[PDB]
C-alpha cells in the first residue's frame, strides 16, 4: 500500500524531533544493528503508530528498518557496504502477558511475556526454502518451508506423473540462522494445582546473550513466538506497602514474629524454622577484585524420626518463597542437578539446559535415597554456585547458586544418640561440610507435650499475634532485592576471640573440629538476621544469635559425651 | 440426497434454538437456556457452547435426535451455519465450537464397530498419555501464482490440501499456490491416549488403548491419569481415531432415605463389606473405613494435608487376607491391583515420545486411581527404589517426576492397601513389629492401621470355617449372601462421600486424652493421631452423622486399642 509512504515520512520527521540521534550514533559507532525505541515515546507522539504496531507488526516492521537505514545512511556515509539491514528493538510494552493467556486472539501481534529459558540452541539450521530431486527422471522442483511444519511432501513430478522416491536438495537453498529456546513459566507465579506451560521461541539477528535458568522478559510477535527484544533483568511491592514494611521492621523485634509466622499448622520448635528462615532470607555475595566468590546461600539439612514433619514444613516454605521449586525425588531423579547437555530428537542435535531456580531455593526430600549423578551434581553446586557443561561442542558455565533445603532419614529409623552423625547417616564429611546448619529432632514423652502438640495439630484440622502470610512473603521479596548490609571493623574482632576458644575446646573433648567455614556461616547468619532486621549494617548482638544457631547444630550433631560442651557454651549463651 | 435435507435440518435446529427462551422463574415450567447462554458469552466471545442431548431429545418425538445422531458429520456445517445465523441475527475473528454432552448410553472401547463411523459416541476410560498442544491449520489463505489473489481454503482434517482452480478467470492454472498464515484461523490441536478401564476388562484380554484428538477450548482441561468421559465424532486418520468436544472428570432416594433412618446399618456394613470371609471384623472395619476419607481440605496456611487412610495387612501364610484384595478390585471402580513383587512404575514412570523426544508420565499403580484404593500384594518383596518412590508419594499428597531437565509434580490421591508377610512367614509374639516386618521406619510410618492375623487350633470356630469353605464350594450358595446387596451400597458410598462432616470440642477433649493413652503404651507420633482423626470422619460419614459425638470415636479408640 501507499499508506506506508505517509507513515514513513511521519516517523522520519519524528526521530529528528524527539534522544534518537544519540541512539543512532551509539548503534552506528558500535557497528551495531540494534536500535532502541521505547513504546511510550512514539505512543505519546502518535497513538495510531502504536495501534498499527499492536495490530500488524510484521508490516509495521517493513517501515522501521528502512527509515533506520536511511537515517544511518544520511548520518554516516557508506554504511550499506558493511551492514545491509538494521533492526529495531521495541521495548517498554505496557501489557505484560502470561504464558497461560496466550490465546487465538493474540495471533499476529506484539506480546511481552515472562519466563525461564531452557534447552537453548545457537545458530542451529532452520528451513525457509527447499528443492527436491525426482529420482525417476532425475529432476529438480522447489517451494517454500517455514518454521512450524515438518516438511511439505512433494510426490507429484512435472512429467513423470510418478509417486517415486524424492530426495531433499538443500545444496541450492536458503540461508537460515536459527536459535530457538524452549521458554517455560516461572514457578514463583503459577497458581496452585495447575501446571506451568511452555513455548518455543525463535531468536534471529541476539544469540548467546541469554542465561539459561534465569528469569527473562521477551517482547516479540505471536504466530511459535518470534522474539524481537530480550531482557535478562527480569506479585510485587508497591509504594503504599513499602513504608509500612519499614514501620513494621522498626518495632517490637520482628525476628521472633517471623519465626512464629513460619509454622501455622503445628507448634514445632524454633530450631527447624530458624534455619529455614535464615536460609530463605539469605546473605550477600561478595567478591574481591573480581575473584574469590563466596556463596551467599545457606543450605540447611534436616534429620530425625520419620513420624516428625519434615515434608510439610518444606512444602510450606516453598509455597511462601519466590522461585522455590520442590523437586524432591528418589528413583525418579533422572538428570542430577537440573544441568544437562543432551541430544534432542526433534531435529537431531546437541543442546544444553539447566532444567528448572538460579536465585531461588531448591527443596530436596529423602536425601539419602539417590544415585551417583544427582549426588555429584548437587555436590558440584554446593562446592560452587555454578554447573559447567563441557560437551557436544558447547562449553557453558551456568548459574547454580540456589539455596539447598534438604531433608533426610537415618539408617534404621532411630537416631541412635550414642553414636555421631557421621556413623548415623550414610553420607561422609565433605558433603556434610557444605551444609552449614544440621538440624536434628528426636523423640518426646510427658503430659506437657501431649497437652500442647496434639491440641495444636487438631486446632489446625478443626479449622477447615504473628505476622500475616501475605505481608511476610512480600517482605521477603522487598528485603532480598533492595538491601546489602555490610560489616564494619570497629568491634567485630571479638568474634575471632570467641572462635579461638570454641575451636580449641572441640579438640580436647570432642572428636570433630570447627573450621573457617563455620566462621563464614555465622557471618552469613548474622548478616541474614540483619537483612531480616532491615538495618544498614550488622549489629553487635546478631552474632550472639548466630553463635547460638551454630552451637545448637554442631553440639547437637554429636554424641551424649560432648555433654560438658553443653555447659562450656553456657558462658556465652 | 442430503443437500436438500441439510437446509431442512438447519431450519429444524435453528427452530429448536429460536423457539426456546427462558421462563425458569419460581421453578415452574421448563424451557431451554440457550439464548441467555449466548447473551452471557457476548461479552467474552469464546463461542464454545454446550448443548445437552437429553434436552434435544424431546423434539420430533426424538426423531430429530436420531436423524442427527447417525449423520452428524454430514450435518455439522449446516448446524454451525444455523448457529451462525441465529447469533448473526440476535447479536452483531470468528470461530465456533458446538459441543454435545450427557448421552444416555455409555459405550466401552471394545464395542466400537464400523457401523458407527461418523456418528456420535460416548467413550469412557482412563487417560494414559498426553500430547502438548499444537496449532491446527483448520483454514489457510492461499495465494495464486500470477493473480496474487487471496483464497480462503478450508481443510478437511486429513492432510495438507491444495486448491484446483483459481476463482478469478485471469488464470486457469493448476500449479502450486503458496500458503499464507495471516488470514488462516488456527485452533489448538491435542492428541491424547485413552485406555480401557480396569473394572471392565475381559478375562485374559489386554486393555486395548486408542488415540483421541481434541480441538477448540476442550483442550488443557483433561488432567493426566484421571478417569475421563468424552463425547465426540469417530473420524478416520490415514487408523480409526476420535474427536472429542466435551470433557469431564468422572470418578434410589427412597432406598437411601430408608437406609439412613435406622440404627443397625453399620453392623451389617462391617459384615457386608466382605461376605466371603469368615471372621476378621477389625480388618473389615478398616477396609470399610478405608474407602472413604475426610477433612483433608485446606490447612489454615495454604498446604494440603494427608486426609487419606492407609491400611496394611500382615500375618501368617495361607489366610483369607488376599480374598479382600480380590474383592476390592472386583467391586470398587476406582481400584488398581498390583502383584508387588513384579513391580518408578509404582510412582508413575516416564516414557519418551519421538515428536519432540519429550517425556510423558504414566501413572502406573500409584496414580491410576482417583479418590480410590491402590492395592499392593506382597509389599516386602519389592525393591528399595519403588518403596522410596511410595514414601516420596506419601509424605505429601503428590508425586514428582524429574526427567530430561523438566520437573513436574501432581496431586494423586490414593489409599494404599498393603499386603505384607514376615521374613519367616510365621508371626512370633516374641518381638516387635519393626524387626518382624523387615522394612525401615519411614516406609513403616504414614500408615493409619495395621492388621495382624495369627492362627492356631481352635476347633469351635475352625469347624465352622471349614464347613463354610465346603459349603461355599457349590453353585452360587446362599450362605455367602449379605443382609443387603451392593446395589444400594455403591450409591450409599457416593452419598457418604459427598457429605463433608466436622469435629466438635468434646471430641477434641476426648482426643487429647486418647492420644495420651495411645502414647502411654510406648512408634507413636502425630501421624497416628492424624490417622485416627481421618478415620473419625470416615466413620461419621459411614454412620451418616454430621456433627460427631465422642461415642462414635470411642469405637475408633477401641479399634486402635485392638490393633
Residue numbers in the entry:
A (entry chain 2): 201 to 218, 226 to 412, 414 to 431, 450 to 460, 474 to 595, 599 to 706, 756 to 864
B (entry chain 6): 103 to 194, 260 to 405, 451 to 463, 512 to 603, 606 to 784, 794 to 834
Study authors write:
Orc1-5 and Cdc6 belong to the AAA+ family of ATPases, while Orc6 shares homology with the transcription factor II B (TFIIB). Here we employed a previously reported Mcm6 mutant, which is missing the C-terminal WHD (amino acids 839 to 1017) and is referred to as McmΔC6 or “mutant Mcm2-7”.
The previously reported 3.9-Å resolution structure of the WT OCCM aligns very well with the mutant 3D map.
